[PDB]
Design a protein around this ligand. Structure first.
Ligand code: 0W7
Length: 836
């Protein structure tokens, strides 16, 4: 259209990180169809949201207030400090009051009501017809022991969020030939092409070409006639073409987004495997048209146009539903689930095991399944089970409707719940066969309904866009169809944020280069760090930006003097920022780490599960003092990390008292007391230590990341312990004698805190077991979309053994107590070993 419209699209391109208008790496118009197909659901959400409520984004939870927070409010009183420049009073509030109602007990109490309640030093607001007990910031203050300092000011202008105006024949495939520029290697070996029909990873039919010597060009021109008929092709079928010696792979949809059968000449560029993951399921081809392996294929063959169970049989089926998500279905089991479709339907938790039993390569069977889906009585009115819903969104299911019934359950999730699972759901898009889908349209809508959900969504999409060449095609389209609806308010914010993170990443890679691999850190690289920051703080670094992992915090100027580089193998950047928000309570500068080398996506996923792991314990009234710091991956092996103030590494405390590489059990307790100003805060630090050393000890054990080096765990000056750097004899978890010495026990004995330690650990361990399916599915998704080439059995299976699936709570209690004992015997053996 207009020239200004070109600049708007040019503005979006830089914000996404990928050119959406690009049509060089595509053989069809699935991107453009999806791009225009998302215009309706975007405007159907933009023109549907409340302009005022969206501007203020009041983050609220609807879950009941837990028992470990009612103890602080053992008086039915809340002390709010309403700031107003040089004026601040303390109005006593009841734990069941309304933002509008508490204003009335202020204006009349002091002595015009067009003002707003806003957090001091943050962009968080307290408004809406919701009890003050339901605000997450209020509950945050009650957890750590803080006072809710609010400020009286004018509500943000809702006009700033202005969105700018807008056959029965058997299927066959002709494998013509392959082409590759460079091949030279060691000894010669044979090579062939394997064609497969995929629908949820399971192969419906397999054909194979004749083995030939691996040369820079091999031609077959042979038809591979599959046994499956053209009419028996299910919606979202994949033509999996793979070159074995496996070296190259590429996928192509047998049925397009238009329901039409794909036909014509196709030359695809295949991805290379490093000498399973979602990257093997992608529909997009390799943009590196030069160095990648080519493959020419031809297609020319539109479509899609009572009896109650006996006692012993139903008891056999009930056992199949009771089994874990990672339990294989026998040909005997596969038939039982299907034959009794109607009785199997009456169990929400049986759907994943039901649809896996469905043979999708049959016209009639598929047709009967849709008839089964038409009568979703129990499923629709059932209580929302998240882990169950997630199961129907993984790789195992590719049917558009089977995945659609899951998204329906996600609709009932509120904003707070979306924030917990946002990373995984955005990651779950990889398992989708098509670009436009119910799940994709869902995340878009929720991101447009909430500024906070949208903020993380932006960085969650942008993470995969920058580095994952497999799915960046899809994610970029989803991001564009969000930026066109988030409003100019956030569009400005993202431009500020993108400029900052890109400028500093360039500095990160420059400084990391100007030094060797060996740790040293000289005044040279320190002065070079100082020099580059001086040029940025000028007319380069924008006045103030929003912290990507903490949207409420608005960081601005740099504390250049407090910046340095760590004396480690991979050189990062310790950075501190001045809070541009002047209504703040302290001079506390915001700490940010820019690190290259480690894959932050993996660290990002672990932290998210930990954030979910807290809510699991929260529902059962348990606090485990988990401290999942902010972390968002922005590019390849490079991203952003939060700094926890007053936190020191347990290993460094050993370096501060004993030798540099050469361990005293007493050191830890001495460090806590000297940093403690009073005796009480020390007792609070000792108690907090138990909780945090109980939270991570359980969490890190389940996820299989328990065996960590001494430097990989850090502790605050207030006793809060937490693991760091989730890059990727043995010990279940880290619990060395120096940790025990603080609790009172030394060298296998018993103390009042160690009994409490075991009490909390057990009560936390079985509490997770009551969510077995939710944790397992997130674990399986984590490895497939975050980690590299995982084991399709061994790696996923680990968590089943760790959660002791099968045995009762009493055997489980004993099992976990046994795992502690394994750490009681080794002591320092493992930590001393950590060198190889
Ligand atoms: O690299 C680390 C160790 C580390 N620290 C992390 N942060 C430290 C601050 O608290 C949150 C976790 C995360 C992480 O993954 N690894 N620390 C560091 C690096 C450069 C300069 C100064 C300190």
């Amino acid at each position: 259209m207009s020239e200004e419209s070109q600049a708007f699209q040019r503005q979006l391109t830089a914000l996404i990180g990928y050119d959406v208008t690009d049509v060089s790496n595509v053989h069809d118009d699935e991107l453009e169809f999806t791009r225009r197909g998302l215009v309706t659901p975007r405007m159907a959400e933009v023109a549907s949201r409340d302009p005022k409520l969206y501007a203020m984004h009041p983050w609220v939870t609807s879950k009941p207030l837990p028992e470990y927070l009612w103890k602080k409010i053992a008086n039915n009183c809340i002390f709010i400090v309403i700031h107003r420049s040089t004026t601040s009073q303390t109005i006593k509030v009841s734990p069941d009051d309304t933002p509008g109602a508490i204003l009335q007990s202020f204006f009349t109490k002091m002595a015009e009501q067009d003002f707003v309640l806003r957090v001091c030093g943050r962009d968080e607001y307290l408004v809406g017809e919701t009890p003050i007990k339901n605000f997450q910031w209020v509950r945050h203050c009650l957890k750590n022991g803080e006072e809710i300092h609010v400020v009286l000011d004018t509500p943000p202008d809702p006009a700033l969020d202005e969105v700018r105006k807008e056959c029965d024949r058997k299927f066959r495939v002709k494998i013509r030939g392959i082409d590759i520029p460079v091949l030279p290697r060691n000894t010669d070996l044979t090579v062939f092409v394997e064609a497969n029909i995929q629908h949820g990873q399971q192969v419906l039919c397999q054909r194979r070409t004749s083995p030939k010597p691996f040369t820079e060009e091999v031609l077959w021109n042979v038809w591979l006639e599959f046994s499956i008929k053209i009419k028996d092709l299910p919606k979202g079928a994949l033509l999996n073409l793979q070159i074995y010696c496996l070296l190259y792979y590429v996928n192509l949809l047998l049925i397009d987004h238009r329901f039409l059968l794909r036909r014509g000449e196709y030359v695809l560029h295949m991805w290379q495997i490093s000498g399973f993951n979602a990257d093997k399921l992608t529909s997009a081809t390799n943009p590196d048209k030069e160095n990648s392996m080519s493959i020419s294929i031809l297609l020319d063959n539109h479509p899609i146009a009572r009896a109650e169970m006996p006692n012993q049989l139903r008891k056999q089926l009930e056992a199949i539903i009771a089994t874990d998500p990672l339990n294989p279905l026998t040909a005997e089991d596969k038939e039982l689930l299907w034959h009794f479709r109607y009785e199997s339907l009456k169990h929400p938790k049986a759907y994943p095991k039901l649809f896996s039993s469905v043979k999708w390569g049959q016209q009639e069977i598929v047709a009967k399944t849709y008839q089964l889906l038409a009568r979703r009585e129990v499923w629709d009115q059932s209580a929302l089970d998240v882990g169950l819903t997630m199961q129907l969104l993984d790789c195992n299911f590719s049917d558009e409707n089977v995945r659609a019934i899951a998204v329906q359950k996600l609709e009932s999730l509120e904003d707070d719940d979306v924030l917990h699972y946002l990373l995984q759901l955005v990651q779950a898009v990889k398992f989708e066969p098509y670009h436009d889908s119910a799940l994709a349209r869902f995340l878009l809508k929720r991101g447009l309904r909430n500024k906070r959900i949208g903020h993380f969504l932006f960085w969650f999409l942008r993470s995969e866009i920058a580095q994952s060449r497999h799915y960046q095609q899809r994610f970029a389209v989803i991001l564009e169809a969000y930026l066109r609806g988030c409003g100019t308010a956030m569009l400005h914010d993202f431009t500020q944020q993108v400029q900052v993170i890109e400028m500093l990443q360039k500095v990160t890679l420059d400084i990391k280069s100007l030094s060797a691999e060996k740790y040293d850190v000289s005044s040279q690289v320190i002065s070079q760090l100082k020099q580059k920051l001086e040029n940025l703080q000028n007319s380069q670094l924008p006045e103030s930006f929003r912290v990507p992992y903490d949207p409420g915090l608005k960081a601005g100027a740099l504390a250049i003097e407090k910046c340095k580089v760590m004396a480690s193998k991979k050189k990062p950047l310790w950075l501190e920022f001045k809070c541009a928000d002047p209504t703040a309570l302290s001079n506390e500068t915001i700490g940010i780490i820019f690190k290259h080398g480690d894959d932050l996506r993996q660290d990002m996923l672990i932290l998210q599960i930990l954030r979910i792991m807290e809510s699991i314990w929260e529902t059962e009234s348990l606090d485990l003092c988990l401290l999942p710091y902010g972390c968002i991956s922005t590019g390849d092996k490079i991203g952003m990390i939060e700094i926890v103030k007053d936190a020191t590494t347990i290993a460094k405390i050993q370096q501060s008292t004993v030798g540099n590489t050469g361990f005293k059990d007493e050191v830890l307790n001495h460090w806590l007391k000297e940093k403690s100003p009073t005796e009480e805060k020390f007792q609070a630090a000792v108690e907090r230590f138990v909780y945090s050393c109980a939270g991570y000890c359980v969490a890190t054990f389940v996820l299989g990341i328990g065996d960590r080096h001494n430097d990989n765990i850090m502790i605050t000056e207030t006793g809060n312990l937490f693991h760091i750097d989730f890059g990727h004899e043995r010990v279940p978890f880290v619990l060395t004698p120096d940790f025990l010495f603080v609790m009172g026990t030394s060298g296998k004995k018993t103390s009042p805190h160690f009994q409490k330690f075991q009490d909390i650990c057990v009560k936390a361990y079985l509490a997770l077991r009551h969510h077995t399916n939710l944790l397992i599915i997130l674990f399986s998704m984590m490895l497939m979309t975050g980690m590299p080439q995982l084991t399709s059995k061994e790696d996923i299976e680990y968590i089943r053994d760790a959660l002791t699936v099968g045995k009762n709570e009493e055997d489980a209690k004993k099992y976990f107590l046994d795992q502690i004992e394994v750490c009681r015997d080794k002591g320092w053996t493992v930590q001393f070993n950590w060198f190889l």
